Design a binder for this molecule. Sequence first.
Ligand SMILES: CCCCCCCCCCCCCCCCCC(=O)O
Lengths: 171, 171, 171, 171
Amino acid sequence: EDPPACGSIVPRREWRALASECRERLTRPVRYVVVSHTAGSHCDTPASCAQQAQNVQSYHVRNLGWCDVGYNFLIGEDGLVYEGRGWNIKGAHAGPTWNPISIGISFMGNYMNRVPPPRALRAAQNLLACGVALGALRSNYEVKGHRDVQPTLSPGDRLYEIIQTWSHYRA
Amino acid sequence: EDPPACGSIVPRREWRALASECRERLTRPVRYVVVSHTAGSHCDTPASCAQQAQNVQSYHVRNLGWCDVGYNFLIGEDGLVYEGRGWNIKGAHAGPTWNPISIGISFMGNYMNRVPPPRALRAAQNLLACGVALGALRSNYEVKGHRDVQPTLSPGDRLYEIIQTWSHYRA
Amino acid sequence: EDPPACGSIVPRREWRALASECRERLTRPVRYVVVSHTAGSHCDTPASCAQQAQNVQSYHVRNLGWCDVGYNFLIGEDGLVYEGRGWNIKGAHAGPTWNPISIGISFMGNYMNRVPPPRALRAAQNLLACGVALGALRSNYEVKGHRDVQPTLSPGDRLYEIIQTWSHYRA
Amino acid sequence: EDPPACGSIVPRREWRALASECRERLTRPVRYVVVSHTAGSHCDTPASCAQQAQNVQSYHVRNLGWCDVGYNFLIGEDGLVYEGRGWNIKGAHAGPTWNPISIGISFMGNYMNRVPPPRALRAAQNLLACGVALGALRSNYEVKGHRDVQPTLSPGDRLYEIIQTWSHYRA
Ligand SMILES: CCCCCCCCCCCCCCCCCC(=O)O
């Protein structure tokens, strides 16, 4: 409840995910959200994004031998969320301490030198309130930048700068 | 016991490192070597590299609350090697899979667009040879890029292209 | 040209096993390994363990109606691995979710209040390393207690405790 | 991912070996393997074959004044490999020509009028492949029977005929 919805996420089958092999569960309501980037190419259409989400997965599963793409959800510059490991499965995105207690969402692109467009930002915002509404995320969830829990440049200077201002951001 | 056997590393205390509190050990002889870059700025004097080593440790220890700098050794463009957690102590540089069974060496800089100078490449090779000589690494140890084991651009394209040519490189 | 190498196993006919009727194949390479005990009488002679294997197979096939012994491999305290369904055929040891995606090995005996002697531990670990060598296991494979994937005391408190220390264990 | 040793060798300490005193290093990769019998009592349980290694070692050490058991490894009718001098400590099993250029393995019992069990033979073949894998034995290695290289009836007639069928055997 409320039955109304969450909605507007591209399902795995629809971007043609390879089947996941992951079996580890997050405990809902999940306290933490970690915001990463692909550091990769971005994509501004559902056709390229679905392909991009695909490439990201191919890296993690094929090259790295992982169970599935590492993130719970991915965000496109086309303004749409891509189902990754989803609300219920532990991602592989922020280390053995943050993985079991957070949702990892990754913007598809390199935001060291670019700001992700407004619609990508809206998509992430709506995805998170989506999560609250479902009970997947605590009403007072905390948003962390990837670099805050792991040594890395992601989510990129520009993007890290933007999230730092979000309501649910925590030092 | 007679002096003839490798060495010349800038010791922790010399670069002024904070006391490590990491207790977790590796098992010699170690099979795997993971090459990373700091992804931040670079330095080309013992002056600046000692300082920079300090910065990287500060971030991992002060910001991330880690027991020590995540790397086992750092490589400066001054051509010197900076003692991180060293041969014996499990670091935090490539995930719960690679960390207990590798030695993480990080070049201080960003090699997406730039190559480390010869003296930096020699410092790192020579270090490895020294690790073999000591029985800290296997005689047939394997080198991998960060990006071969974790999803990241590290250790930067240019540097990645070089480690790939190494005698001990195995993707 | 044979398949190399790897490890030593007591064949089906050597422990006088009934012919298997199982046909459903596992998809190589397998990501998971599940460790159980049989909660059966234990054994410490080659002869006494071949006998126990027959008893366990006998229970599975005659009373449970399975196509063969449920386990892929069994372990005796005699230090020997007994071949069950083997690397290629799906076992019945861990519920319909895990059976299609795992290798189940089972230590013959009850491990609530006993330890398996070091030789059984060695065989089990070598069996696994050799599953990897063959490409029947993945290199980044993961071992799980039976109790981690089903509500059961299996593989016994003592032995569960033991297998938590393994390189490859993921809860 | 993962330690430690192939061929599931019973370590010297587990059979209660008196401490070794040998020091002559063997020059791996070793070209020859030499197969013998002990001409001693045989044994069929890991307990009786511990005792028997012990009995052989004691003869060599206490009686013959040797630094350690003559054999690099011993093979039991229990089906296990008993560590003697190992891969790098040059053995005393085949005399001044063969000791420095072969690895010597001995089956525990007399094999003039009987054969060792299939598991005993499996364990040796395993052991050998575990040797090549370690770069202890060279890939293209030759196997000789004790008699091919020394005036003795060892390894026993029945055991001799079997090893002549080994892919790697050379008269
Ligand atoms: C292929 C997976 C490697 C796992 C090695 C564990 C089992 C021991 C070896 C059996 C197959 C690979 C041989 C190399 C093992 C060397 C380990 C060591 O020296 O400590």
